[PDB]
Specification:
Chain lengths: ~200, ~200
């Protein structure tokens, strides 16, 4: 049972918006929430552990929301447009959740528990792309080739999505997030016949 | 002057390999290079400034290893292919400077000099891609209709290029750098006529 876990996460979230990632140390957190570093090392095990938990907290709160009803809403193109705007809304609001993820992924992990948190959020994003991509393929594609194509398209879509964040971050004025995801869809649709053709070379 | 400055960057490069980005401090840098703190601030003026100079240095050796479109070997048709093979070869090495670039770009800095360095390295990458996208255009296309289309494809190429690094970092085993950059080439080639016919209306 942890009440203090919530107080620590809130304090560090304030320190992240102000001092930043590099300027935030364990002493700063200690001063903000009024807990000893050993007590902080108790709950999250590390300074990075707090960041991992903070980014994890943001994930389930933001990422996981209302994924399901797009299927029942309609079989039609409104599905992609639902997921598009859902992914756009996630991107266009520019949360510190996305910021914390890329911060931790690039950071060398001295706390192996942090990596496990990163992989959970990463695989979550991959699955969300894989789901919407499988429906972009025509239904007559054989199941064998359909798997390899989706896999390669997924990594492509995920890589594009990562660059969208940095584009909106480093070029806020000239970047249209919805338009870039529109181009992604057009790119994927064009890659399918090319991807199909390269699997026939067996 | 530049001699002592280079020694600091080398020592800082050592620390970034072994030690975390947030964990490393101006004190830790002193231990490695053996230089007094006040002598470090004279060259840079902050810890973040030291990391910025090292990243920019690593960035310049990266871009110098990649020939421009005119410098590229071979006939005019495959020039773009020769460029991509060098970018792939370097991305396959997974350079440490990029990891620091994405680290610094998301950082909110007290020092405006840091943001200026990140901006300069960012603009370089964009310009290098912009040059390549221009040469992918059909011969009969005038520079007039080009710019709006080129700028959009450039941002797309930059975005995916960012995601390639994150893919290789988070999925070292299942990620093929050459394959992903091949999909980029194929996507761009398909998107060129598409974006061109959209401006036929405009």
């Amino acid at each position: 049972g942890e009440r203090s876990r919530e107080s620590i996460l809130d304090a560090t979230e304030r320190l992240m918006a102000t001092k930043g990632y590099a300027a935030t140390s364990i002493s700063d957190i200690r001063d903000a929430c009024g807990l000893a570093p050993s007590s902080i090392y108790w709950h999250f095990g590390s300074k990075e552990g707090v960041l991992a938990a903070m980014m994890e907290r943001g994930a389930q709160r933001f990422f996981a929301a209302i994924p399901t009803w797009d299927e029942a809403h309609g079989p039609v193109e409104q599905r992609s447009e639902r997921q598009l705007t859902e992914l756009v809304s996630l991107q266009s609001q520019h949360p510190d959740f996305l910021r914390l993820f890329y911060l931790l992924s690039m950071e060398r992990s001295q706390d192996p528990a942090v990596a496990a948190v990163v992989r959970r959020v990463r695989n979550t994003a991959i699955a969300r792309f894989r789901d919407s991509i499988t429906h972009l393929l025509p239904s007559d594609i054989p199941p064998g080739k359909a798997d390899l194509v989706v896999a390669e398209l997924t990594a492509f879509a995920v890589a594009l999505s990562d660059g969208v964040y940095f584009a909106g971050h480093l070029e806020p004025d000239t970047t249209d997030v919805e338009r870039m995801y529109r181009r992604l869809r057009q790119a994927l649709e064009a890659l399918i016949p090319v991807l199909l053709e390269e699997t026939h070379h067996h």
